[PDB]
Amino acid sequence: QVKLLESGAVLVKPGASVKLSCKTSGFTFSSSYINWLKQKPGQSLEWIAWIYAGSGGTVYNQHFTDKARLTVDTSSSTAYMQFSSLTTEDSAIYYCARYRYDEGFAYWGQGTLVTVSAAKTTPPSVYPLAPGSAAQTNSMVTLGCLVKGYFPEPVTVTWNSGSLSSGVHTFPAVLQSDLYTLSSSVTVPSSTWPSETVTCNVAHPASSTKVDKKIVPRDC
Amino acid sequence: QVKLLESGAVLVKPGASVKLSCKTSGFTFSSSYINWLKQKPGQSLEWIAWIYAGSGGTVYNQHFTDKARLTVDTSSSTAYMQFSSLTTEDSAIYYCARYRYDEGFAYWGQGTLVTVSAAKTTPPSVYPLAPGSAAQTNSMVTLGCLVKGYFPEPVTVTWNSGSLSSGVHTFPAVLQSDLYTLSSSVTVPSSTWPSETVTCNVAHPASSTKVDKKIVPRDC
Amino acid sequence: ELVMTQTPATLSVTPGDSVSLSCRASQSVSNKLHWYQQKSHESPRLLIKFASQSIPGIPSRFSGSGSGSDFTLSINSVETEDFGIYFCHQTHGRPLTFGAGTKLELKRADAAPTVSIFPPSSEQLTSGGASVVCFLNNFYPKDINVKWKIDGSERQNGVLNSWTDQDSKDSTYSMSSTLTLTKDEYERHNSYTCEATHKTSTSPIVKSFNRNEC
Amino acid sequence: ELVMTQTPATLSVTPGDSVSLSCRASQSVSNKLHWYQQKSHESPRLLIKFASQSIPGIPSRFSGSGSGSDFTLSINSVETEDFGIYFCHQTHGRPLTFGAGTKLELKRADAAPTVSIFPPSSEQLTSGGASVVCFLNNFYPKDINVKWKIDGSERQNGVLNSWTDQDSKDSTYSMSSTLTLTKDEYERHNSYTCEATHKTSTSPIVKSFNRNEC
């Protein structure tokens, strides 16, 4: 497979700078025009600049010159964007994408969420949501996980390490003053729970937090 | 050697169009940006456009769009420029040049003289120029050849089919109304002439003319 | 900069139908217009390159046309998984620009929500807090109201609602409502009720639990 | 367009000297400035690439410097074969532009021309025309005046002059003057004289012929 792998979500202070990475594989790096784009949640994409990996030649959106700096490392097929003098308005998702005259922007990285804030990271409190001695009684049973009071975004939530993909609904985080809260639900056949273990996995990059919360029948 | 070989000089009528060729060799054609430039005699160069041989992509000087059309033939490493709706002001020498981020415009073709005119092709009158019974008397003797009233440019003048390279002075053609006149001189040791034969060869491509004018002592 | 105007801004369609999205350029972009599909929580996926060229692996239902300043993306036989935002992009002039996008939504038959109520986790109560969570899953349309009642009285204070995007497989919506109380207010009451409201069901759907029972 | 101003327009220098040519951009071109040497009847030769980078094969006496808007080409120890036009070129903004050029001429010690006069070919007389040709070879400077006298009177009408390029080995020039008469005017006179004039020789250099003698 051909792939563009971006660096993790970062929280950075106003006035600081970040260096984003974009590791590539599966395609010829030298002939690649690696582009970087900015996307504010629920808005269109903004093109920042591109760099021809073959020459190191760069072309910038005049609105980002003196702000962004692109480089490339041909030996490791990795592209970098150094963004400086960050302001809270620079908080957004940043993508790297490969262009070629014969393919357009065919390859895209997964995006890196950059948060520019003076506040420190607050890891989330993860709570297992089990039904009480009263519901369930049916063919399907819904369990949940509450991911409360964290900063900044995002958090990733999987169930049984990705083994349970079906029946999952992870809700968009909601900002409460200065902290986010999110929840996820999974519906499994009663055949599955409580006989077997259902654990929700929550990862919060910015604080290097990884929690596993097993859902146990509430005896209390 | 690395080389750019252009098509021959052409005479074309007003409102007509030409297709100029630029055969390349000695370098990777695919990674080449073939540029075409215009130069009026005794003036600076004018960039017309370039084409990247790898993609067929073109970039034109806005003053020549709708006028010029560049194409490439990767199988024969040849680039072409089709110039249309020619006016007499388009008469000039046209060059093709190779650019690469690595080397700038390092390779240039020899240029193609394009004469846009309604006048007709006229072959030259070739006259041998011998000294009269009065000069010479010295170690060196100067003979000459007058190439009078031809159109269009150019004509090629050699002496003894090139065997006589030293002492040759071919003068720039001068336009007289609508016809050109040029002359050439050759200085040889009295050892050589009149003992041996000195012949000036004049070739005028446009009219398929090839004249040989032996220089003989003027007895009259 | 070359401005790209997309229309319509939003479109609701029935699976099986055919639609055509418009992308206008403030000036000519030759054949340098591309189309992308973007699903939430995902990077753009190239659908059409250079106005009408197709890409290996993209469903044949997608096709584009036009040149100069008028372009069109057509989807014949819209499927459920075609939900998303569609953007056009021009790579003819610098800086490269994108359109504001067209949001494609799908039609479906009404569906009532499967409601689930969850009492506070014991771990949270120990820390002094009590969040009561209610999931209203897979319903249609998106209009749905949730109401909380503590010991029979409605409480508006402390409720956080969140909705997912339309489901790619069955075109429904889901939502979660969280009522956050202090451990003290929670221990001071017994019955906790979440009720979904929307003209579909002959009336509300209710879910409750009594703190006393464990 | 980025305008490039070159100075000086013309420069006459003695071999062994050193000189610097200026190229100034109406706006910044970063390091995307190149220098070319163009000899007459020849295509441009790249001397310096990207403001100061040297091209292999080019004499070390050439070096360039600058950035932004101010650039300079320097030749230390100017040689005879360095005559020509020097152009600077920017490849930073579209359209690519060139400067008007700087004409480099070499000074030399005055040299008197070797003069040769040729009466009309007999073949030409047969056709009704008579061109008297005079070659003034390898002299210096280029400001050599030629005057024609027919039977002692000067004729300006009917003269065509042509100069070659400066010699690469010795910086001398050559020129040819052709007086064109009708066969009738020619047969109506006897003495034909061509004289070279220039402050070098204590006075004019003369060459003549008498139609009557053959």
Ligand SMILES: O=C(Nc1ccc(CP(=O)(O)O[C@H](c2ccc([N+](=O)[O-])cc2)[C@@H](CO)NC(O)C(Cl)Cl)cc1)C(F)(F)F
């Ligand atoms: O060599 C190195 N870097 C490097 C050198 C030159 C360039 C400029 P380019 O990409 O060739 O410019 C292109 C280019 C320039 C000229 C050209 N040509 O044929 O004349 C072709 C392509 C083109 C790209 O946008 N430029 C323009 O269009 C300008 Cl004029 Cl707006 C870029 C990077 C390094 F080793 F030092 F890092």
Ligand SMILES: O=C(Nc1ccc(CP(=O)(O)O[C@H](c2ccc([N+](=O)[O-])cc2)[C@@H](CO)NC(O)C(Cl)Cl)cc1)C(F)(F)F
């Ligand atoms: O695909 C074919 N031909 C072909 C396709 C695309 C182009 C445009 P390009 O040379 O890639 O444009 C460059 C290019 C475009 C986009 C880009 N990027 O990374 O987005 C990089 C380079 C660039 C060159 O100047 N254009 C601009 O800069 C515009 Cl925006 Cl002014 C040219 C030719 C074929 F079917 F014929 F084979």
